[PDB]
Amino acid sequence: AGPVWTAVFDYEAAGDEELTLRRGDRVQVLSQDCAVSGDEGWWTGQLPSGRVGVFPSNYVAP
Numbered sequence: 791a792g793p794v795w796t797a798v799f800d801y802e803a804a805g806d807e808e809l810t811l812r813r814g815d816r817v818q819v820l821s822q823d824c825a826v827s828g829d830e831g832w833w834t835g836q837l838p839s840g841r842v843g844v845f846p847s848n849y850v851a852p
Contacts (some may be wrong), residue, residue: 792818792836795850809835816851850852 797811806819807828811817820842824830827844836842
C-alpha cells in the first residue's frame with residue numbers, strides 16, 4: 791500500500807513517461823521527489839492498472 795490521491799481534473803500525458811489522469815482516477819503516489827519525477831511539482835504515481843508514471847500534482851486531491 792502507498793498513499794492514494796484522487797484526480798480532480800483530467801490530465802492528458804505529453805510523453806510516454808507521463809500518466810494520463812481522468813477525473814476520479816485513484817493514484818498511489820510512490821514519490822513526491824522531483825529527483826525521481828524530473829520536475830518540481832510532478833510526482834510519481836501508479837494506477838490500479840499497475841501502470842507507473844509521472845504526473846502534475848495540482849491534478850490530485852486527498
